[PDB]
């Protein structure tokens, strides 16, 4: 087995991983991934964060990151003993594509090349229009200034105490709510924390 403290997983900081014959143990709250739950391996150098990209049947995708280029000859050395699976997305970059609703993901396949697969665990709210325009608004759990990094807010596609009616200048009319240790300003303009 191998132990590394520089493995990055999940808009957060890095974590730790532990290899085993029975499964994989990922600790940020320990999590166990069994060997009978993995379906496919999509480890490749065409995308950023060159590491293993495993698919699991437990409504989650193991998008582990933080591995060197010399680890592909090592980690697959742990795969030929039991899994014996060889690891082989989209690079065209054109606007043409097809949206497919999977069991837990949203496949964006641009003529047989899948590009996006977003799980439903990080989804917060969804809205639709009369012109079949779908907008998914999320809320990334930002913890600190350093560990948050870049974070997504909304994705659009085409197919305690709270207050109401509050006028603000820094200008418009919106609403504000007080959380346990934060305040959320919501309205037609934007959402602020």
């Amino acid at each position: 087995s191998t132990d590394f403290d520089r493995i990055y997983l999940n808009s957060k900081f890095s974590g730790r991983f532990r290899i085993a014959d029975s499964g994989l143990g990922w600790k940020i709250k320990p999590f166990l991934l069994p060997a009978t739950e993995l379906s496919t391996v999509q480890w490749s150098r065409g995308c950023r964060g060159y590491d293993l990209k495993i698919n699991t049947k437990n409504q989650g995708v193991i998008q582990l990151d933080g591995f060197s280029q010399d680890d592909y000859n090592l980690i697959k050395n742990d795969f030929h003993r039991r899994f014996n699976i060889q690891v082989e997305h989209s690079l065209r970059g054109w606007n043409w594509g097809k949206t497919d609703l999977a069991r837990n993901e949203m496949v964006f396949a641009l003529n047989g090349k899948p590009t996006f697969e977003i799980p439903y665990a990080r989804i917060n709210n969804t809205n639709l229009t009369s012109k079949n325009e779908v907008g998914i608004e999320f809320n990334i759990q930002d913890e600190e200034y350093q560990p948050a990094g870049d974070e997504l807010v909304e994705m659009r596609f085409y197919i305690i105490v709270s207050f109401q009616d509050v006028f603000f200048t820094t200008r418009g009319r919106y609403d504000i709510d007080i959380y346990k240790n934060s305040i959320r300003l919501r309205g037609k303009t934007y959402e602020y924390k």
């Binding site: 490749s44 150098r45 065409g46 690079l91 065209r92 970059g93 054109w94």
Partner: protein, 39 residues
């Protein structure tokens, strides 16, 4: 002058016939990023 005036009448009359046939249809106006993973 009378000949060319009668000619202008005849050409307007045949202008009607040559214009009529061609609009017999409807004539409705209304109805890369990368090539390899090495990059």
């Amino acid at each position: 002058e009378q000949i060319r005036k009668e000619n202008q009448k005849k050409l307007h009359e045949k202008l009607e016939k040559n214009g009529l046939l061609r609009f017999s249809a409807a004539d409705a106006n209304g109805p890369e990023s990368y090539v390899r993973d090495s990059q």
